[model samples]
Target: GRGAAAAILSLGNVLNYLDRYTVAGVLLDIQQHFGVKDRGAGLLQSVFICSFMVAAPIFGYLGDRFNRKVILSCGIFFWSAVTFSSSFIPQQYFWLLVLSRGLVGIGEASYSTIAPTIIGDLFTKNTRTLMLSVFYFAIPLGSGLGYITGSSVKQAAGDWHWALRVSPVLGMITGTLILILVPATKKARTSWLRDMKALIRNRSYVFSSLATSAVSFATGALGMWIPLYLHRAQVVQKTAEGAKDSLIFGAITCFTGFLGVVTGAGATRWCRLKTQRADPLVCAVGMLGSAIFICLIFVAAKSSIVGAYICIFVGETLLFSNWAITADILMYVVIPTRRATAVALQSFTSHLLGDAGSPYLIGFISDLIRQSTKDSPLWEFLSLGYALMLCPFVVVLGGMFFLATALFFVSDRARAEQQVNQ
Candidate 1:
């Protein structure tokens, strides 16, 4: 029944991402409603991400020492319930809504840090990579769906509040299913500090984890910026706007993202069987190619809509190719009992350094640039374009870090295998 467990966990991951991104879809809506600036609206996402990042290590600790199944279920229920109730909160209390959003982060952090450890536990190494490929795609797929659902709900239901309703309903159903089918993992016997120190001391884990932090900036900023960028760009004649824009971008991202992970994992799986150093090598390859395409995306953005999307497809495919390889490297390097801690620490580092400030920084910088361009033409286009330049640059730096990971990968993996065999 690992298949069953994998399906349920994968589904849970979908919901996790679905709920995480629902706000991005309606960010424009929230701003117009509350009369806030772009930076303020963007702060909502930053706050939630900060909350999630801040809370993940604690959950990571709990995940290692407690019944991860129960903790995971509670997280699902708590977030779902919070989301459900938040929908009914009066719009006049905008800060309350923001606080509710931050609270949702706590619940999500609980689930995200531990769920993959469960997957790693349930499968063979080869199978784990494939299952993880499926698991990680949930991020882009759910993010795309969140955009679709939020915009579609607002367009059809006549209220943005309905966009918040979808995740809770789906989560409630899936969380219940998981409770019945997923078995509990035994807790670690080691102290939290000892486990964390072990993780921090591992050079391969450190490099891979930081590489994760580096690349996450692109996904984090771009996910929030792209739909808005497309709609605003409208360079091509009769380009889609609003809901249509989100839907098309979401569809593109979802499929391209899916293909990238599977393609990366497939290639890496082949490489891995032939050699011990395949994991970081494959990741380095993906990150470097992704940076090239990501930089080209801006060139494409200046002209035709289709041109931009083509870059996105290529860039995202390369960008997403690193997903399964990342988890594989971590799980392979760390002991099973400490895997959740590794994930938690990875989550904290990746987000705090990666996405936590990225969206907000992008927005703030865009607004700052826009102020100077207010009397000039192409204000929105130029402002956002320059701000987003940060993404490709950061991604390139991340690619180098991934390449650096290759230097230590073989030695670290050997030691981990030795510990496991002992």
Candidate 2:
């Protein structure tokens, strides 16, 4: 039952990201046509997250008490419909297009907050870590596929709009699977306020949430703009028609993400062999270690194209590896009935404090640097280099937060689990 059902949701997870990120492939195209500033382009992502996280609490509430399968199906249908509809955005209305993209946040909020909770409930203990890893692996893979799929379709179909059109059908297909195939889980008996209070009281969960915020700040900046960053860095030649740069960057992200999560899971296994503190310890060390590789991005920016790709691979592998371990902590550290609300709270807090600020902050600083460096020979590249410095440094700071998480791990998880047993 887990095999077929898990695969269905996993595929649904894949399409979740596939539809969400389809625009990344076309961002540069829209930027040039609209003559938008780097700040402007980054604001588009800010809009989406603002919408995405703002609605997370609402869905988080709905998912906890309702039939999660029905809620999830409706969310998929709603978002897919929007994605399909957005492809028809009139050629010239830039703000309308941005508005349509923002609407996508509504649909996405529903799926993301609830999906992992379902996966967590389906499996237990160490296997819980593995299942959640398998579930989240879809994120990077789907994102990479979205980029590649978008490029291939744009090239063959003669319009970018056609590329955007692909995910809706897949979303609907999987939406149907979820509704028909997935069974229901127990709903929470607690009221929203009580759940929120319980979540706030869990120190392990709070620290994890804080650490997630820090990492999200760095990761959001890197993931959202790295394609544009690579193209601008001349890691691949910059040209309007060539999708080569986006394709390569996305591919590297996918591979490194896959590898890193595997290696991180290994670290979790090793740590668990020694201590019950493995979850946060694995996340802390991996992220701290990953901060070093992320700093290598600076070196990559200045080095040869292949050198840049190599650093990206190393850094991303370590960065993404922590997803499973951290998600495991969030789900299991809290009790079952409250897991959905816990994920939503974590999602809401991390985005609001972390990524919600990263893209725009980096862009704003880059613009300021641009104005100062206008007369310099390498003005364009240097501005981005200066702005992106914030990411590596902030990522390192997050490592300390993850480290702090170790202080509370054992006691808090024990308290929660003991209560559940009672």
Candidate 2 wrong stretches, greater than 4 Å: 1-6, 63-70, 114-134, 173-195, 198-202, 235-242, 275-278, 331-341, 375-377, 413-422
How far in Å is the alpha carbon of 67 misplaced in model 1?
4.5
Worst 10 residues of 2 by lDDT: 233-242
Off-target runs (Cα >4 Å) in candidate 1 are 1-9, 61-70, 88-92, 114-137, 176-201, 235-240, 269-276, 332-341, 375-377, 414-422
Clashing pairs in 1: none
Cα RMSD, each candidate = 3.7, 3.8
lDDT on C-alpha atoms for all candidate structures = 0.81, 0.78
Candidate 1 local Cα displacement, residue 129, angstroms? 8.0
lDDT of 2 by residue, 168-241 (tens): 88788898888677777553445756999978988888888888888788888887777677667673244332
- Separately for all candidates shown, the number of backbone clashes (residues 3 or more apart, or on different chains) is 0, 3
TM-score of 2: 0.84
